[PDB]
Amino acid sequence: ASTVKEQLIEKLIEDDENSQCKITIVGTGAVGMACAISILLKDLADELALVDVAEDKLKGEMMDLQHGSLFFSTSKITSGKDYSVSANSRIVIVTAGARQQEGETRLALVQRNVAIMKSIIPAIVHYSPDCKILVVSNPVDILTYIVWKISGLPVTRVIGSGCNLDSARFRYLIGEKLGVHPTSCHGWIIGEHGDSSVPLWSGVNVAGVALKTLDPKLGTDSDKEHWKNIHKQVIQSAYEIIKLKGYTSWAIGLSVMDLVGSILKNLRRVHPVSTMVKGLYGIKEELFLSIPCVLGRNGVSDVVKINLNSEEEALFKKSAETLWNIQKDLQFLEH
Amino acid sequence: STVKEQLIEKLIEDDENSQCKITIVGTGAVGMACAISILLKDLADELALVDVAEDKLKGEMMDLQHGSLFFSTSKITSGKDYSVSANSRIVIVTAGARQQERLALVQRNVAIMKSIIPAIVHYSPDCKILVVSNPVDILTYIVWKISGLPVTRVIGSGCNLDSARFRYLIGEKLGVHPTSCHGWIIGEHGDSSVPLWSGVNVAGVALKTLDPKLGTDSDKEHWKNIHKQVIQSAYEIIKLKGYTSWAIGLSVMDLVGSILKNLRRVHPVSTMVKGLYGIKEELFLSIPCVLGRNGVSDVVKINLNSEEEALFKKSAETLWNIQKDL
Amino acid sequence: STVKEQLIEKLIEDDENSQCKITIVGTGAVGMACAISILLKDLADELALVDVAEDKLKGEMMDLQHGSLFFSTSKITSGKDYSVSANSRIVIVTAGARQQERLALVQRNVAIMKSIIPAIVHYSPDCKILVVSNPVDILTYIVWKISGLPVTRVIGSGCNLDSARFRYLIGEKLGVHPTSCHGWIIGEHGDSSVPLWSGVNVAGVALKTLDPKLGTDSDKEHWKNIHKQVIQSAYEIIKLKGYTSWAIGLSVMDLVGSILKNLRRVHPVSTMVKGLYGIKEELFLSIPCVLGRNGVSDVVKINLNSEEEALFKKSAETLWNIQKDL
Amino acid sequence: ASTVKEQLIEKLIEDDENSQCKITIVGTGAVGMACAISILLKDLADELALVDVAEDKLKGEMMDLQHGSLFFSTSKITSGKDYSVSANSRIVIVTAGARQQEGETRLALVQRNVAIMKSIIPAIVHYSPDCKILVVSNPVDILTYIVWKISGLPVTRVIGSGCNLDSARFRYLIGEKLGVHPTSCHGWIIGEHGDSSVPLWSGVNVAGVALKTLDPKLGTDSDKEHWKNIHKQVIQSAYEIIKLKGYTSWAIGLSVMDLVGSILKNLRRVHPVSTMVKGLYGIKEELFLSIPCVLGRNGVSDVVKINLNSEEEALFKKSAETLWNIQKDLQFLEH
Ligand SMILES: NC(=O)c1ccc[n+]([C@@H]2O[C@H](COP(=O)([O-])OP(=O)(O)OC[C@H]3O[C@@H](n4cnc5c(N)ncnc54)[C@H](O)[C@@H]3O)[C@@H](O)[C@H]2O)c1
Ligand SMILES: NC(=O)c1ccc[n+]([C@@H]2O[C@H](COP(=O)([O-])OP(=O)(O)OC[C@H]3O[C@@H](n4cnc5c(N)ncnc54)[C@H](O)[C@@H]3O)[C@@H](O)[C@H]2O)c1
Ligand SMILES: NC(=O)c1ccc[n+]([C@@H]2O[C@H](COP(=O)([O-])OP(=O)(O)OC[C@H]3O[C@@H](n4cnc5c(N)ncnc54)[C@H](O)[C@@H]3O)[C@@H](O)[C@H]2O)c1
Ligand SMILES: NC(=O)c1ccc[n+]([C@@H]2O[C@H](COP(=O)([O-])OP(=O)(O)OC[C@H]3O[C@@H](n4cnc5c(N)ncnc54)[C@H](O)[C@@H]3O)[C@@H](O)[C@H]2O)c1
Ligand SMILES: CCNC(=O)C(=O)O
Ligand SMILES: CCNC(=O)C(=O)O
Ligand SMILES: CCNC(=O)C(=O)O
Ligand SMILES: CCNC(=O)C(=O)O
C-alpha cells in the first residue's frame, strides 16, 4: 500500500515462468537473429531464450529484441551463457559455428564446428530432455549426425535444416522462369544441402502437370530450354550472395521459421529436411541426408519413399558415401 | 499394398497430445463466431466442438474442416461426449438461450452449466473456463462453484466487449482508431455497466480534463450518450439482426490470446470481487484483471470515485439478490 | 470549444479514397463468413456491405464495427444504395437463394444479378467481380455479360472450395496436411466436377503411379469415393446444418488474397473456357488460372486425358443448355 | 507450343508491374534490412524496392530476401542504384547514413548524412511524387527537416521515425517494473529522439489510472521508487546496446513496421513521430520534433495538443532551440 505496484495491482497467484511453447536459439550470429526476428514476427513462441559465448553481443542482441516487445506478442525474451535459460524448450535451434560449405571443405573448420557441438549438446539435452534439436550450422548434414550421436536422443527428434531452403530457392527460380508464385511451382531438392544436391525433375510440376511431360529433356544438358541451369543457380546463387554480401541469413531464417511452425503447430507437412537415412534408398550406413519428411510436434514422424530413378538414386548414394567418409573423417581425428 | 503403405514409412506413432487445444461448448452463432476467429489467428493446435444438437454440431465441424487448407489448426473434432474435449487449455462456454442481465430463463441456462461443467473439468483438469453465456456475471459465478476450480481460472467474457464498443464510439466521435482511444467499462456486462470517465483518454490526456462535465447530464457535448449507446447498441443489433455474434467472437479471441500466449495484458473481465470496493459477498463482476496462462493472475485496484463506486456496488447487489434465488 | 477541438488540431482533410476497398453484396451466411475472414487477415482497408434487408444489413455491419479494436480494417460501411460500394478493388457477390448446379430458382438469382451488377460496375469501374452465388458457373457467365467487363475480371469462386475439400479428404486418408497433398477438381462446382487423378500427388509422387487403378471402380482402395465425398460432403452439411458458410468464406478469402497482393498463384476458378478442350460456346467452368491484381492473367493448359476431357465437355454442355433458356 | 511456358500457360493479358502498395527502402544496412524483413513478414507491401550505393551488398541482400519468397507473400522484390525502381512507391523509408546520436554530436557526421539526403531526396520525389517519406537516419529530427526542405513536399508527408521507439522502450521498462505487458502500460516520450527526450509522467498510466496519482513524486529525484531512472534507461539502454553489439537494428525495424502499418492501412492511430512543430507548444521557428500524431494514408493528418506542464514545456522548448541552431549549424557550412 506504499509502492505503485502494490497500490495498483493485487497479486492473486504467483506468476508462472514455465512457458509452454519455448524456443532457445544457440548462436546469435547472422543466422541466429534472422531466425529470432522471424520466429517473433510469426508468434511461434511464448518465450524465446538466446545462448552464445559472446556474452556482450548476446546481451546486446537480446535487449534490442526486447525493446520491440510492444510490436510482437512473445512475452519473455531471455539470454545467457549458462544453458539453464534453455530449460524446457520445445525446440532448440543450433546456429553456432563458422561459415563453410559441404562435401569439399577444409576439415579444420568441419572439426571446429564439431567441437562446438560437443560443448553444447550435452547441456542442451540435460535442460530440455523432451526437445527437438533443429541443426542449422554447416556442414548441416554432418553436424546433424554428430549432434544426434552426442545427444543420445531419438533419431526422430534431431533434425537438420537440410534442403528446405534449397527447395525454396529451387521453387523461386522455377517461378521466375514460368511467371508463377513459388507456392504454386512444386519441385524438390534432396540429399546434401549445398554443393551436391539432387534435383528431382520427375516431380517438378504446376497444377499437377509434370514439366518433363511437356519437355522430355528437362534437366538434361541436351535441353534447349536449359532448365538444368536452374539447379546450378540454386546451388551457386548461395555462393554468389556470400561473395556479394559475405554470408546468408534472411532466407535460412525464413526456412527455419517454416520448419518451426510445422513442428510446434503439429501440422504434419512434408518438408525436405535432414534425417538419418540408413535403410532407405539403398543406404546401409548411418548418415544424415535430406528426404521428404512428415514434420509434427514429435519431430520426424514419417518419411516419404520417393521412388528415385537410376540417375537420381546414383547421385543420392554417391553423396551418401561422401558424408559417410567425412563422418569417418572426424572419428580419425578424435582418436 | 496400399498407396499410404508404399508412399509413407511410419517412424513413430503420432501423438494425440495437443499442447494447445481449445474446446468450444455450444456451436451456435456465438460459438462458431469464436471458432472461426480462433482459427484465423492460429491460436489453437486442436479445436474441439461440443453441443447437444448432434446434426448441427457435425455440419458445423465438417464445414470448418473443409477449410483446413486455409488455416493452420491441424485437427478439428466434435462430439456430444466430453471426452473429445480432453486436455484443453481453455474451454469456452457459449451454450445457452439468448438472454440479458425473467428468472425462468436464468435458471434455464444454470441448468445447462450444472450438466456440462462437471464433465468439462473432469476431462480437462488444468483448463481455464471462459464463460460467455448470459447472464455472464451470474453464470461465471455458477460455473466457478460447480467446477470447484480456483477463482482465478474461471473468467467471464464480461466487459471486454463492452469496453471495445465504448472505444469504438469514442473513436468515431474523435476521428481516432479505437486502439488509441482508451476508456473502461466495468461492472455488469449489460444495462448497469459503469463507465470510468476518470480515465477516458487519448495520448494520456484525460478527456474530462478538457471538459470537466464529461459524462454528466450537464455536459453540453453529451458524452454520456456514448455510454447509453454502449448498452443500447447491443439491443439495437438484436432487434435488427436477431442476435450478436461477430464482436463477441472477436472479444473472446482477444482474451484467449492473452491467456494462451501469457501476455499479462489487462482486460476488464468478470472475476469474483469479494473484498474490493466494499463487496462483502461472492459475486462476479468485470474489473481490470491481468490475464496470463493461468487466467487472472492479478487485478487492478482502480480507486473508484464517489459516484462510480456507488453504481458498482449497486450493480453488485442487483446480482447478489438474483443469485440467492437458488 | 469541444473536446475534439481542444485535443486534436486538424492539419489536412482526411481522404475517403480507400486504396484497398472491398464490397460484399449479400450479407447472409456466406456473405458475412467472407466478411469476417477478410477482416481477420487484414486484406482490406475499407469493407462495405450491401443487401436488400436493410435491418439485417445494419445489424451485421454494427456487430462487425464493435469489434474494430480487434482487427485492422479502419472503416466498415453499409447501405442499400451501391454508392457506398464505390471504388472497391473487388466486389464479392454472395446474394441469392440457396441452390445447386429446377429452373424457377436459377432465374430467381439471375433476376438479382441483372439488378445489382450494373450499379456495381458503375461505381467501381476497375473492380474485379468475384461471383459466389449459385449456380456459380452459370451466374459468373451472366454477370460477365451484364457487366460488359473483360472476361479476365469476372471470376467464379468455382472449384477452389471443391479442391480444398478434395485435398482435406486425401490428407485424412494419408495422414498428411492438406497443403502437402496436391490434387485438382475442375469443371462444374457441384455434382459433375472432374477429378484429375493424373496429378494427385505428394512430394511430386503421382499417387496413381503407386496404384494404377486410382480413381476407377476397379480400384481395391476405392479412392473414387473421395471424389463422391467431395460432392456429397456439401449435401450432407446442408442437411445437418442447413447451409454451407465457413469453408466457402475461407476459399473466397484465399482468392481475394491472390488477387489483391498480386501473387500469381494458380487456383481452379470459374473462367470462360471457349477455345479450350474443344469448347465451342461461351460458358464458364473452373480450370487452373493464375490470379493477380487484374483477375485471371493466365490459364493453365492441362492435357486432359481420354475420360477426363469427356466429362469436362459433358459438364460443359450441361451448362450451355441451361444457359440458352433465356 | 514448343517451350514449357508456352505449352503450359496461355497468357490472356500482359501482366501489370505497377504495384499498388509499394515500399522502397533507401539504405540496406542493419536498419534497412531490419525494416525489410519486418515489412515482409507482416505483408505490408505488394512490392519492395531496395536502393543503396553499395551495389554488391545491395544485390546480395536482395537475392537473400528473394530466396525466402516461398515463406512470405510479397510477390516482387527489386533493387538497384538508379532510383527508377523507386517509382510510384506509397512510402519511401530512408535508412542511409552514418551512425550517431543527436544534439551533442560532431558536425562532420551530421553534415555527412545531410549530404546523403541532398543526393537522394530529389530523385526519390521525382519518381514517387505522391509518396510519404519516412526518415530513420540520425540525427532523425534534423534530417527529417532537411529532407522536407529539399523535397518541397507537404509537411504532412515527410515524417521522422522520432520517438515511436523511445516510447516503446519506455513502455517496455514500465512493464518490467509493474509486471504487465507493454501494450497495457501507456506512457509517452516526445521531443528529441535519443539523448534529450521528454517523458510525460503526467500521462503514464495503466487501465486509466495515472501512476503519479499513486506516487505524487513520480519522475522526480525525490521519488523513493526511482521511476525517473526508467527514462534515463530509455535513453542509455540504446547507448548500451551500441556498446555491446555495435548498433541498433531490431527494435527500430519493428518501430518502422508499426508506423508503416498505420500509414498504409490508414488506421489513424496516434504515434509520437517527428513532424514540424512551428506554431505548437510555443514554438516559433521551423524545426522538427516528436509529438503525438494521427497517422493515416496521407501521412500526418492531425496532431494532438497535449497541455504540457511548465517543466515539460521547458525541456521541449529547450530541445527545440537545440535543433534550431543545428539547422542553422548546417546552413552556415552550405555557405
Ligand atoms: N543450413 C543452411 O541452409 C545454412 C544457411 C546459412 C548459413 N548456415 C550456417 O550456420 C552458421 C551461422 O552462420 P552466421 O553467419 O550466423 O555465423 P556468425 O559468425 O554470424 O555467428 C554465429 C555464432 O556462433 C557462436 N558460437 C561459437 N561457439 C559457441 C558455443 N560453444 N555456444 C554457443 N554459441 C557459440 C558464436 O559466438 C557466433 O555468434 C554457419 O555455420 C553458416 O554456414 C547454414
Ligand atoms: N457475454 C457477451 O458479451 C455475450 C454476447 C452475445 C451473446 N452472448 C450469449 O451467450 C449465448 C450464445 O448465444 P447463441 O447466439 O450462440 O445462441 P444459439 O441458440 O445460436 O446456440 C447456442 C448453443 O448452445 C447449445 N447447448 C444448449 N445446451 C447445451 C448443453 N447442455 N451442452 C452443449 N451445448 C448446449 C445449443 O444446442 C445451441 O446450439 C447466449 O446465452 C447469448 O445470450 C453473450
Ligand atoms: N460457390 C460456392 O462454393 C458456394 C458455397 C455455398 C453457398 N453458395 C451460395 O451463394 C449464396 C449465399 O447463400 P447464403 O447462405 O448467404 O444465403 P442467405 O439467404 O443466408 O443470404 C443471402 C443474401 O442475399 C441477399 N440479397 C438478395 N437479393 C439481393 C439484392 N438484389 N441486392 C443485395 N442483396 C440481395 C438477401 O437479402 C440475403 O441476405 C447462395 O446462392 C448459396 O447457394 C455458394
Ligand atoms: N530513428 C531511430 O530510432 C534510429 C535507430 C537506430 C539507428 N538509426 C540510424 O540510421 C542509420 C542506419 O544505421 P545502419 O546501422 O543501418 O547503418 P549501416 O552502416 O548498416 O548502412 C546503411 C546504408 O546507408 C547507405 N548509403 C550511403 N549513402 C547512400 C546514398 N547516396 N544512397 C543510398 N544509400 C546510401 C550505405 O551504403 C549503407 O549500406 C544510422 O544513421 C543510425 O544511427 C536510427
Ligand atoms: C555457407 C553454407 N550455407 C549455404 O551455402 C546456404 O546459404 O545455403
Ligand atoms: C444477449 C445479450 N448480449 C449483449 O447484450 C451483448 O452482445 O453485449
Ligand atoms: C449451395 C450449394 N453449395 C455447395 O454445394 C458447396 O457449398 O460446395
Ligand atoms: C544511433 C542513434 N540511434 C539510437 O540511439 C537508437 O537506437 O535510438
CATH number at residue B275: 3.90.110.10
Contact B156, B286 (CB under 8 A): yes
Same-domain status, D172 and D94? no
Q: How far apart are CA C235 and CA C252, in angstroms?
A: 20
Determine the 3-state secondary structure of A169 from DSSP. helix
Radius of gyration of chain C (CA): 21
Identity at C23, one-letter amino acid code: T
- Rounded CA-CA distance A160/A133 in Å is 8
* D8 within some domain: no
Phi and psi angles of residue B263, each rounded to the nearest 5 degrees, phi first: -80, -25
Select from C145, C161, C152 the least CA-distant residue to C94.
C161
**A141 and A168 share a domain?**
no
CA distance C206 to C91: 38
Of B7, B221, B240, the CB nearest to C59: B240
D130 and D197 share one domain: no
Are D273 and D191 in contact by the 8 Å Cβ rule? The answer is no
Closest to A241 (Cβ–Cβ): which among D60, D211, D241?
A: D60
Identify the helix (H) or strand (E) that includes residue A177: helix A164-178
Q: Which residues does chain B have within 8 Å of residue A292's beta carbon, measured at their own beta carbons?
A: none
Q: How far is the CA of A260 from the centre of ligand 1 (A)?
A: 18
DSSP, res B173? H
Instruction: Tell which atom from ligand 2 comes closest to the C-alpha of B31.
Output: 16
Residue of A nearest to C268 (CA): A207
Residues 67-96 (B) with a CB less than 8 A from some CB of C: 67-71, 74
Residue type, C204: G
- Mark whether B120 and B222 lie in a shared domain: no
In a domain, B6, yes or no: no
Q: What share of chain A is helix, strand, coil (3-state, %, to 5)?
A: 45, 20, 40
- Please list every residue in chain C whose beta carbon sits closer than 8 Å to the beta carbon of residue D297: 15, 17, 19, 45
Q: What is the DSSP string of A187-202?
A: --EEBSSSTT-EE-TT
* Cβ-defined contacts of B211-215 (< 8 Å, 24+): B211/C2, B211/C3, B211/C6, B214/C3
Residue B26 CA to ligand 2 center (angstroms) comes to 6
Are C80 and C116 found together in one domain?
A: yes
Q: How many domains does chain A have?
A: 2
Element (H, E) at D158: strand D158-160
Q: Is B180 near chain A, with CB under 8 Å? A: no
Q: Are A100 and A145 contained in the same domain?
A: yes
Is A109 in the same domain as A85? yes
Domain boundary among C138, C156, C174: C156
Joined together, the cell numbers standing for residue A210 give 509434370
E-strand ranges in B134-272 read 154-156, 181-182, 185-187, 193-195, 201-202, 205-206, 265-272
Q: Which domain holds residue A30?
A: 22-160
Q: What residue has cell string 490459364? A: C299
Q: Does residue D259 fall inside a structural domain?
A: yes
Query: In chain C, what residues touch A209 (CB-CB under 8 Å)?
Result: 199, 300, 302-303
Task: Tell me how far apart the alpha carbons of residues C230 and D150 are, in angstroms, rounded to a whole number.
Answer: 62
Distance of residue A183 Cα from the nearest chain D Cα, in angstroms: 6
Q: CATH number, domain at B29?
A: 3.40.50.720
The CB of A89 under 6 Å from ligand 1? The reply is no
Phi, psi of C36 (to 5 degrees): -70, -35
- Closest Cβ–Cβ partner in B15, B263, B298 for A297: B15
Cβ neighbours around A24 below 10 Å, total: 28
Query: Is A8 part of any domain?
Result: no
Residues B56 and B146 placed together within one structural domain of the fold: yes
Report yes or no: A307 and C205 within 8 Å, Cβ to Cβ: yes
Method: X-ray
Q: Where are the alpha helices (DSSP H) in chain C?
A: 3-7, 29-40, 54-66, 103-123, 136-147, 160-174, 207-210, 224-240, 246-260, 306-323
**How deeply is B154 buried, as exposed, middle or buried, from its count of CB atoms within 10 A (0-12, 13-18, 19+)?**
buried
Query: Is B233 close to ligand 6, i.e. is its CB under 6 Å away?
Result: no
- The CA B231 to ligand 2 mean position distance, Å, reads 20
Cβ of D109 less than 6 Å from ligand 8 = no
Q: Distances from the Cα of D54 to the Cαs of A245, D82, D96, D109, in angstroms?
A: 10, 12, 11, 19
What CA–CA distance (Å, rounded) separates A101 from A116? 17
- Rounded Cα distance between A305 and A202, Å, is 14
DSSP characters for B104-139? HHHHHHHHHHHHHHHHHHHH-TT-EEEE-SSSHHHH
Q: Is the peptide bond before D272 cis (omega within 30 degrees of 0)?
A: no
Q: How many whole angstroms separate alpha carbon A147 and alpha carbon A93?
A: 12
Work out the number of other CB atoms within 10 angstroms of the CB of residue B187: 31
- The sign of the CA dihedral C274, C278, C284, C290 is negative
Domain boundary among A109, A140, A160: A160
Chain A residues touching D239 at Cβ < 8 A: none
Distance CA D134, CA D159 (A): 5
Structural domain includes residue D28: yes
* Shared-domain flag, residues C145 and C263: no
> Quick check: B72 and A21 CB within 8 A?
no
DSSP C171-238: HHHHTS-GGGEE--EEE-SSTTEEE-TTT-EETTEEHHHHSTTTTSSS-SS-THHHHHHHHHHHHHHH
Residues in C touching A292 (Cβ below 8 Å): 202-203
**Residue D194 near ligand 8, beta carbon < 6 Å:** yes
Same domain as D172, residue D155: no
Q: Which among B122, B156, B190 is the end of a domain? A: B156
| Residue among D7, D10, D268 whose CB faces C74 most closely | D268
In ligand 6, the atom with minimum distance to the C-alpha of B101 is 2
B22, B127 in Cβ contact below 8 A?
A: no
CB atoms closer than 10 angstroms to residue D20: 15
Spatial separation of the C-alpha atoms in residues C10 and C7, rounded to whole Å? 10
In the numeric block, the cell 552514418 is attached to D98
* Burial of B305 from C-beta contacts in 10 A (0-12 / 13-18 / 19+): exposed
Residue B80 has which C-alpha cell? 456430444
C-alpha cell at D100: 550517431
Q: D291 and D266 share a domain?
A: yes
C-alpha cell at position A28: 546469435
Q: Residue B45 and residue B74: Cα distance in Å, rounded?
A: 6
Question: What span, in angstroms and rounded, lies between the C-alpha atoms of D290 and C117?
Answer: 48
Of D9, D20, D304, the CB nearest to C19: D20
The answer as to whether C8 is a domain residue is no
Retrieve residue B244's grid coordinates.
450478436
Cell of D217: 513524486
Q: Are C153 and C127 in contact (CB under 8 A)?
A: yes
Side-chain half-sphere CA neighbours of C37 within 13 A? 28
Residue D226 near residue D173 (C-beta atoms within 8 A): no
In angstroms, the CA A300 to CA B14 distance is 10
- Check if the beta carbon of residue B269 is closer than 8 Å to that of residue B155: yes
- Cβ–ligand 8 distance for D138 under 6 Å, the answer yes
Known active-site residue C227: no
Compute the distance between CA of residue B20 and CA of residue B37 in angstroms, rounded to an integer: 16
D49 φ, ψ to 5°?
A: -110, 145
**Residues 6+ away with beta carbon under 8 Å from C267:** C158, C160, C254, C255, C258, C288, C289, C291
In order, the DSSP letters of A187-254 are --EEBSSSTT-EE-TTT-EETTEEHHHH-TTTTSTT-TT--HHHHHHHHHHHHHHHHHHSS--HHHHH
**Residue C147: which of C173, C167, C129 has the closest Cα?**
C129
Interface A-B, measured as beta-carbon pairs within 8 A, has a size of 103
Taking the CA of B110 as reference, the closest ligand is 2
Q: What are the beta bridge partners of residue A190?
A: A198
In a domain, C12, yes or no: no
Whether residue B10 is contained in a domain is answered as no
Best residue in A71, A201, A270 for a mutation probing chain C (most C CBs within 10 Å)? A270
Chain A interface test: which of D71, D230, D234 (most A C-beta within 10 Å): D71
Nearest CA in chain B to A297: B15
Does residue C165 share a domain with residue C70? no
DSSP strands (E only) in chain B: 8-10, 21-25, 46-50, 75-78, 90-93, 128-131, 154-156, 181-182, 185-187, 193-195, 201-202, 205-206, 265-272, 284-292, 295-300
Task: Please indicate if any CB of chain A lies within 8 Å of the CB of B7.
Answer: yes
B190 CA closest ligand 6 atom index = 5
Q: Whose CA is nearest to atom 4 of ligand 7?
A: C234
C-alpha cell belonging to residue C184:
485438382
- Chain C CB contacts of D21 under 8 Å are 19-20
Residue whose C-alpha is closest to residue B73's, from B234, B251, B256: B256
